[PDB]
Amino acid sequence: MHAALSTEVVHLRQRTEELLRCNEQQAAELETCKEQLFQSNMERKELHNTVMDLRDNIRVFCRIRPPLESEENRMCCTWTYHDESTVELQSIDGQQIFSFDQVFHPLSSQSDIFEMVSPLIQSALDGYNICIFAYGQTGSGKTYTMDGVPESVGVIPRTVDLLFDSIRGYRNLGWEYEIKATFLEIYNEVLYDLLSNEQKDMEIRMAKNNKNDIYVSNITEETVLDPNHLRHLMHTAKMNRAGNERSSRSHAVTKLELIGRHAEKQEISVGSINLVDLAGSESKNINRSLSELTNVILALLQKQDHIPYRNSKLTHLLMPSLGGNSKTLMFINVSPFQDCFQESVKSLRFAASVNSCKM
Amino acid sequence: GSMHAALSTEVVHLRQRTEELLRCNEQQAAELETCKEQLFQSNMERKELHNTVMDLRDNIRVFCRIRPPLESEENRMCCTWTYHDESTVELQSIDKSKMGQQIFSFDQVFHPLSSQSDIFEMVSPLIQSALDGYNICIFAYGQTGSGKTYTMDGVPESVGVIPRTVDLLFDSIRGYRNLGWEYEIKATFLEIYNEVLYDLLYVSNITEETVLDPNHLRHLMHTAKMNRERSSRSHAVTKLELIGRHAEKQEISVGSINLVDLAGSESPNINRSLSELTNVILALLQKQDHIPYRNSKLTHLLMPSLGGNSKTLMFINVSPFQDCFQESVKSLRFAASVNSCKMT
Ligand SMILES: Nc1ncnc2c1ncn2[C@@H]1O[C@H](COP(=O)(O)OP(=O)(O)O)[C@@H](O)[C@H]1O
Numbered sequence: 075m076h077a078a079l080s081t082e083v084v085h086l087r088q089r090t091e092e093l094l095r096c097n098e099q100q101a102a103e104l105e106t107c108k109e110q111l112f113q114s115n116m117e118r119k120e121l122h123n124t125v126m127d128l129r130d131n132i133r134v135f136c137r138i139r140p141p142l143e144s145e146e147n148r149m150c151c152t153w154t155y156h157d158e159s160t161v162e163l164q165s166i167d168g169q170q171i172f173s174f175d176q177v178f179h180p181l182s183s184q185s186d187i188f189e190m191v192s193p194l195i196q197s198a199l200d201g202y203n204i205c206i207f208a209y210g211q212t213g214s215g216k217t218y219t220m221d222g223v224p225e226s227v228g229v230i231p232r233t234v235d236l237l238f239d240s241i242r243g244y245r246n247l248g249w250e251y252e253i254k255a256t257f258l259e260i261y262n263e264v265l266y267d268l269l270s271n272e273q274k275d276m277e278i279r280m281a282k283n284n285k286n287d288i289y290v291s292n293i294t295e296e297t298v299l300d301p302n303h304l305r306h307l308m309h310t311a312k313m314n315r316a317g318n319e320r321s322s323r324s325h326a327v328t329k330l331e332l333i334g335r336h337a338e339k340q341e342i343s344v345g346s347i348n349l350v351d352l353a354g355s356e357s358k359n360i361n362r363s364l365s366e367l368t369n370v371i372l373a374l375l376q377k378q379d380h381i382p383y384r385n386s387k388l389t390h391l392l393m394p395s396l397g398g399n400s401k402t403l404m405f406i407n408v409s410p411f412q413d414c415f416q417e418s419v420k421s422l423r424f425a426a427s428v429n430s431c432k433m
Numbered sequence: 434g435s436m437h438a439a440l441s442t443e444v445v446h447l448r449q450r451t452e453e454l455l456r457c458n459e460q461q462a463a464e465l466e467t468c469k470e471q472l473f474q475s476n477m478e479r480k481e482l483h484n485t486v487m488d489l490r491d492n493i494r495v496f497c498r499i500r501p502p503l504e505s506e507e508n509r510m511c512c513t514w515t516y517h518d519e520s521t522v523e524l525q526s527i528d529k530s531k532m533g534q535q536i537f538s539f540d541q542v543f544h545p546l547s548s549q550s551d552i553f554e555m556v557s558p559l560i561q562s563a564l565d566g567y568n569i570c571i572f573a574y575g576q577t578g579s580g581k582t583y584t585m586d587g588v589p590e591s592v593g594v595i596p597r598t599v600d601l602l603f604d605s606i607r608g609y610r611n612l613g614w615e616y617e618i619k620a621t622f623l624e625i626y627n628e629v630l631y632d633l634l635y636v637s638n639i640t641e642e643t644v645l646d647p648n649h650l651r652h653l654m655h656t657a658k659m660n661r662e663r664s665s666r667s668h669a670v671t672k673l674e675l676i677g678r679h680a681e682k683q684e685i686s687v688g689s690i691n692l693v694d695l696a697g698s699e700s701p702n703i704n705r706s707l708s709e710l711t712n713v714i715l716a717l718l719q720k721q722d723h724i725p726y727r728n729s730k731l732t733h734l735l736m737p738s739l740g741g742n743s744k745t746l747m748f749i750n751v752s753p754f755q756d757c758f759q760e761s762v763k764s765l766r767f768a769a770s771v772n773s774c775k776m777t
Pocket residue numbers: 138139140142180210211212213214215216217218219223407
């Protein structure tokens with residue numbers, strides 16, 4: 075029937091023109107809401123960085139680890155907690171007292187530690203560079219704090235979990251995030267790729283578009299696809315991760331570069347997270363990176379004019395994440411034992427140098 | 434025929450475009466729901482972070498409010514208002530750098546079109562903390578006709594800060610009841626004119642009350658409001674002493690909320706209390722050991738709440754009009770000083 079089709083056409087043109095109206099209306103509403111969301115997120119980002127600055131871009135904590143059951147044969151120093159920020163230690167055979175942003179003790183949990191870290195993940199997603207260090211003498215607890223164990227995972231695994239939850243959430247703001255992951259060791263001022271068997275010469279050079287930024291030539295830089303992929307990469311690197319004189323004396327750096335793209339407004343947001351399990355602080359090139367790292371941190375705090383980031387592999391690698399608006403957290407790991415007393419004091423004296431430098 | 438064919442084509446295409454546009458209406462509906470929810474979460478987190486910043490800073494808090502022209506005043510000329518961000522506001526005569534400050538940064542600036550609820554949104558955190566033993570003080574400052582009373586009291590159609598505090602107060606309380614805390618609320622209302630105090634129903638002897646329910650307090654609130662060019666020069670104070678009790682442990686929280694709608698700041702011992710407030714702010718900025726809290730009967734009460742910290746919030750109400758310009762600048766330059774006060 076011609077009339078049935080005709081009257082259906084008329085009906086469908088009505089339907090059509092009214093839907094175009096209910097669509098145009100929705101579209102305008104969606105435009106203004108999106109714009110207010112973007113602005114609101116810039117302001118949220120700003121306030122967040124304000125908090126970070128009010129707490130200090132560079133912060134230092136202490137963490138005294140508990141003895142293991144296999145360590146009862148070892149006597150502990152006498153530890154005294156003057157307050158949340160101040161700890162003192164006494165040789166069991168004149169005062170050694172140290173102030174920190176916060177002191178963590180043997181009962182302090184892995185998540186207690188991560189609470190200091192989680193706000194900075196958001197910072198990384200906001201375009202700020204982050205550095206998280208574990209500092210201290212071999213046996214003090216650097217690796218347990220950074221990697222941890224399956225029953226109690228440390229900073230890195232928790233950082234990954236939070237990174238995926240947050241990147242997921244961001245999709246609703248119109249942002250899409252890449253993660254570039256690189257894993258390396260630094261031993262005797264030479265860089266090693268923890269994702270490769272191959273022997274190669276890796277150099278630290280200026281980034282193509284940012285001369286203040288850096289990149290490592292000939293390194294395996296992975297674009298993360300999903301959590302399974304990143305779990306595989308971390309496992310692999312942990313397997314090749316370091317021999318007493320070399321295990322104790324090699325730095326480990328896990329770098330997660332967050333690259334965020336908002337396609338509609340055509341904006342980017344690049345911020346990286348460097349998670350560093352430092353070489354032991356126990357007393358040429360073997361210790362170059364560590365001493366230069368402490369020099370650089372203190373120099374930044376003293377607002378020193380010129381800073382020789384390139385005096386060592388470590389400081390040069392992390393340079394773009396140390397100066398300026400970058401945030402640093404350093405966990406000074408300490409073992410509670412009398413026979414470590416002298417090294418525990420050396421470690422904690424760096425903290426004191428930091429406090430003295432903050433004014 | 435050719436007409437059946439042509440009509441067939443027409444309906445097919447129209448069915449396909451109907452299906453498209455309906456598909457697009459669906460995607461848009463979903464994306465809009467998502468976007469609104471995200472705008473809500475982002476705003477909420479923004480408010481939380483802002484409150485955290487104000488605490489860490491521990492300055493006296495300053496919010497600036499520009500009131501909209503009234504239906505009457507629709508033919509009254511306004512000066513030029515520029516807003517550079519959420520906390521920065523500039524005003525220029527409708528008619529220069531050497532002349533001083535025309536650009537003012539505060540904790541928050543409220544547009545003429547700001548709801549009473551938006552105002553309260555950024556004050557409620559301060560009120561909730563009174564329950565934790567702190568002395569709180571919200572006070573409104575500005576020339577007459579700028580919106581002090583409207584901001585604190587409000588009108589029945591859109592209630593102000595003081596009214597909404599009740600809701601927030603009992604609501605927050607009944608969650609402490611869960612914790613095993615017991616709260617009583619002592620209330621007092623008073624007025625100050627020519628350095629003389631009046632009970633509108635430490636300080637003694639003035640009418641007190643122990644509150645039972647929101648209605649009891651809404652009532653006595655109305656009663657005080659009922660008894661108020663002298664209201665233009667009279668200060669209004671409303672204190673709500675919150676006294677919590679736990680028997681395990683034996684601790685008590687004692688914290689209060691003070692709500693002041695000050696006299697007008699316009700250029701006139703008639704307006705002294707106000708002048709001595711100005712002097713106490715000048716003193717706190719000097720951070721000096723002897724401070725003239727006692728040179729007036731308002732600064733005496735606000736002395737407990739003028740230690741110079743983030744537990745004190747000042748609204749700086751301002752009129753949009755050109756004939757109010759000079760008064761508005763004066764009000765703003767003062768508010769700038771207040772925002773710089775941190776002492777105790
Ligand atoms: N906070 C802690 N709680 C429980 N065990 C810990 C803690 N810190 C370290 N350990 C244990 O003590 C040992 C030394 O830790 P490790 O990270 O190897 O020190 P480092 O890396 O500084 O040499 C590890 O076997 C680890 O399981």
